[PDB]
Amino acid sequence: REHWATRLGLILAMAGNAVGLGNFLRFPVQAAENGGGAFMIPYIIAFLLVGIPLMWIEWAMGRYGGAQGHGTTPAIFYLLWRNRFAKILGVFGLWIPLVVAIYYVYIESWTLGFAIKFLVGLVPEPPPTDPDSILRPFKEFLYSYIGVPKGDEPILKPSLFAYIVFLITMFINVSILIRGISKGIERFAKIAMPTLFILAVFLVIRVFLLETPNGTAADGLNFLWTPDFEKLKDPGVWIAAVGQIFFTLSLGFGAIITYASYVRKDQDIVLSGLTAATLNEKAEVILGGSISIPAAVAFFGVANAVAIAKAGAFNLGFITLPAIFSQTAGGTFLGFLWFFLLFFAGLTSSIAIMQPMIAFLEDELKLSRKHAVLWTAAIVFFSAHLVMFLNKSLDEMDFWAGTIGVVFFGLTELIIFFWIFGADKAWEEINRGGIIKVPRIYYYVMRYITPAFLAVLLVVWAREYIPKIMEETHWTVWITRFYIIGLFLFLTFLVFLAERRRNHESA
Ligand SMILES: CC(C)C[C@H](N)C(=O)O
Ligand SMILES: [Cl-]
Numbered sequence: 177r178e179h180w181a182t183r184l185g186l187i188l189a190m191a192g193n194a195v196g197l198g199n200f201l202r203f204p205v206q207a208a209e210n211g212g213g214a215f216m217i218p219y220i221i222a223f224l225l226v227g228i229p230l231m232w233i234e235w236a237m238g239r240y241g242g243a244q245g246h247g248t249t250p251a252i253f254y255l256l257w258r259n260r261f262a263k264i265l266g267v268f269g270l271w272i273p274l275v276v277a278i279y280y281v282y283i284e285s286w287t288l289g290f291a292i293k294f295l296v297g298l299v300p301e302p303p304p305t306d307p308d309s310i311l312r313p314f315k316e317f318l319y320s321y322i323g324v325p326k327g328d329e330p331i332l333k334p335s336l337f338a339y340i341v342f343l344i345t346m347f348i349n350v351s352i353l354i355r356g357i358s359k360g361i362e363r364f365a366k367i368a369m370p371t372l373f374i375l376a377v378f379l380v381i382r383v384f385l386l387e388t389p390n391g392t393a394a395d396g397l398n399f400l401w402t403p404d405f406e407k408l409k410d411p412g413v414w415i416a417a418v419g420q421i422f423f424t425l426s427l428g429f430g431a432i433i434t435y436a437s438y439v440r441k442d443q444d445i446v447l448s449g450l451t452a453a454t455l456n457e458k459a460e461v462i463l464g465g466s467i468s469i470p471a472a473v474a475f476f477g478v479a480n481a482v483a484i485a486k487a488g489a490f491n492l493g494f495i496t497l498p499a500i501f502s503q504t505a506g507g508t509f510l511g512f513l514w515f516f517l518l519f520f521a522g523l524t525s526s527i528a529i530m531q532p533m534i535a536f537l538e539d540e541l542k543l544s545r546k547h548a549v550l551w552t553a554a555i556v557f558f559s560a561h562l563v564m565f566l567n568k569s570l571d572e573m574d575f576w577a578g579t580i581g582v583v584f585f586g587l588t589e590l591i592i593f594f595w596i597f598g599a600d601k602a603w604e605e606i607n608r609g610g611i612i613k614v615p616r617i618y619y620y621v622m623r624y625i626t627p628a629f630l631a632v633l634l635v636v637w638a639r640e641y642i643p644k645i646m647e648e649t650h651w652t653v654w655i656t657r658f659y660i661i662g663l664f665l666f667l668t669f670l671v672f673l674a675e676r677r678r679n680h681e682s683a
């Protein structure tokens with residue numbers, strides 16, 4: 177079995193796993209729609225009670241399963257709770273990251289294609305003060321890229337260059353992942369994380385030199401870090417906070433478990449996971465929240481910034497920032513820098529959420545690495561046509577997998593590790609091999625505070641919000657569900673195909 181050759185390489189690979197698009201695209205909108213600082217207070221709180229404990233549990237289950245040659249949540253769940261329903265619940269650890277990747281690769285291909293369009297200079301030409309006259313050309317640019325429909329049919333029709341860039345993005349993912357751990361993700365993280373940091377800091381410095389009659393870049397920072405105690409009683413704020421914390425730290429996708437499987441049994445995971453979390457957070461609030469929000473605020477006031485944020489998720493990342501850069505000297509090169517930063521971010525995160533399936537095919541089906549990688553590729557590439565051509569088929573995938581399945585699977589793996597596999601035993605498993613020891617106070621949070629807190633949050637979530645999706649939506653969403661549910665069944669079948677061949681090799 178392969179291993180992280182360099183400790184630093186392990187840390188950088190886990191960072192690139194965590195440091196992705198949620199640090200640069202999701203978090204700005206998440207903070208803008210939720211009163212800014214009013215959203216920071218839960219984000220901080222839920223970072224201590226949910227982020228770090230689930231991080232350490234992810235790492236512990238990963239190292240435990242990897243010591244016994246299993247880097248997937250079905251096998252590891254069977255190794256923590258010996259039952260068939262354990263394997264059934266572990267199937268989610270392969271279903272969630274796959275469904276996430278199905279559209280994560282598409283958005284990463286968006287970033288790559290936009291970087292190419294900006295580098296070659298094939299960009300819109302905004303005529304020289306009306307904000308609509310500047311937000312309109314880049315809006316139509318994004319629409320010409322992804323091919324959003326125009327009439328009544330919810331049928332996407334992406335540009336040919338977009339499909340070509342998607343092919344190139346999948347092929348780049350394949351060329352990276354075909355070289356394993358110590359030769360592929362490690363030597364790529366060692367190169368991408370410094371470049372990512374450099375680009376982020378350069379764009380931060382460039383954004384801070386922006387001033388308009390609608391304010392300066394400091395106003396967005398103020399609104400971001402100005403709390404508002406009038407909103408801590410809104411459960412939607414806490415819902416969004418814990419969801420974003422699950423997302424930005426890869427918590428609940430089973431990918432951190434997958435990388436932790438390649439950790440040598442004796443090497444540290446406590447300080448490792450804490451370091452990865454701290455690096456991702458420093459890349460989030462210090463950098464990601466200090467580029468989009470300050471520019472949008474300085475250019476349109478907090479009111480119109482929140483308006484653009486509530487308009488859509490890509491209004492800020494794919495429209496607002498390029499429209500603002502088109503107003504500055506060398507702004508085409510600046511948008512190229514921004515999109516290239518996003519491309520490496522999505523790259524280091526997407527090569528991380530596609531590893532559980534290959535680990536399953538290698539460890540549980542005894543497939544060669546090349547064939548496992550190529551079949552997982554073909555699966556993702558084919559299934560991505562459902563997201564590329566069916567309108568609003570990405571939102572359902574992100575909801576059930578990246579938004580609902582994450583909290584569900586986090587609670588599940590928490591109850592499995594501590595409440596089932598053994599609170600004392602799993603606590604020791606976390607504290608074993610660690611350079612530093614896990615604080616005594618997080619034992620109670622892991623076993624008592626985190627499950628009850630997440631349970632109350634999930635109760636409020638399911639009681640006051642979900643029934644709006646299973647009714648007030650277009651019928652085409654079923655096409656996605658009918659597929660993704662049918663993608664779950666498929667995986668279970670392979671799980672069966674695992675537990676049967678294991679009864680054959682021993683014979
Ligand atoms: C699913 C994860 C890889 C997401 C990533 N941590 C991000 O913030 O974009
Ligand atoms: Cl295009």
Ligand code: NA
Binds near residue numbers: 195423424456
């Ligand atoms: Na992140």
Ligand code: NA
Binds near residue numbers: 194525
């Ligand atoms: Na990443």
